[PDB]
Symmetry: D2
Subunit: 114 residues, 4 copies
């Protein structure tokens, strides 16, 4: 079984900590990144349909130093070692609806255990 609970890092030296997943798949945690270091909360869910050993999942990071919001989704894989393959959408704040077209960046991130 691949579980999101615990501590994770990526190629950018990030520090992601996720708490216990309840039975409905819900979780909370923390996302720590450089700018000097800031902590921001994350809330998310993990699939529990068919209790897959390698579940898909999703979460939102509500950045504390910034008007933006990021969303991540992906799958917890086994390779023996655990890895989260993710993709993300970073939403910037824009002042007027007609600037919406440029408000959204996309990318990826690979996480592995501390």
């Amino acid at each position: 079984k691949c579980s999101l609970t615990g501590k994770w890092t990526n190629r950018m030296n990030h520090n992601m900590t996720i708490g216990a997943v309840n039975s409905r798949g819900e979780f909370t945690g923390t996302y720590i990144a450089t700018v000097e270091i800031k902590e921001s909360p994350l809330h998310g869910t993990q699939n529990t349909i068919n209790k897959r050993t390698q579940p898909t999942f999703g979460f939102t990071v509500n950045w504390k130093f910034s008007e933006s919001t990021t969303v991540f989704t992906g799958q917890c894989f086994i390779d023996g070692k655990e890895v989260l393959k993710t993709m993300w959408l970073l939403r910037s704040s824009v002042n007027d609806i007609g600037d919406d077209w440029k408000a959204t960046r996309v990318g990826y991130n690979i996480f592995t255990r501390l």
Copy 2:
């Protein structure tokens, strides 16, 4: 005059999304109802941004589909349009379940959705 996530929302596909109270930290929960004339209903959880108490906040949420192994995340902004209507402009990523990490490349879709009140 502020744009809130709380309430009933629909899009051009007749989905109905219903969002509860946004708390002091911007957290909220809700439901995503969609035709799958057969209807299924899945929980969602996420946040809206609170930094500078913006009239048009950014936000994000995860829908944990009840009938599927997939997961979808939405992000976007709650705008007041020219006509005074509140609209959510969103983009999303839909993650499918694959068996081998070598299939990861084909597992992620992207699209968009515009929601208005119902």
Copy 3:
């Protein structure tokens, strides 16, 4: 048959003109947008496997006033009226490889005939 040749516009009052598609699917054209108006070239291909009435396609716009590049892909649909449902990636120029993570915006565009 849905063909990319001709003149197209979208909700942003853009003006896109595409030339003749050869037999391998290749095409050239022009993308015109506000900033005052600038013309930039586009080169692309259209699928010709199975000669579908509603082909998928792709093109790159090489913006003339800017270091960026945009790519579009999508499908030419019939609804009697013709419409291109697209999605796009806008690539910004960043000065150093470790800023790559923020160089890519994503979005959409619907085109219809002039």
Copy 4:
């Protein structure tokens, strides 16, 4: 010391992409070879940016798959890495063929690819 598109490229999946001469307007053509141990080979066409004659230009291209009704577009930048190696960091969209405009939402994938010389 400039990063050029011209040449042979590979990624972490053993695709081999080969790009011809970049002309004065930045246009180029090439080939994308990929396992589909069975190999298929499809044309690609696109541009690199020339505004300010940058040492690390942005670019984009379309691969017109020979064995499929799909289309894929790549965009990214040609960087000189810390070790002096040229690397293409790319993101892509893969468009599938669907029959009805109502299925359009499920037709577009997104991923990434990192290429290095071969």
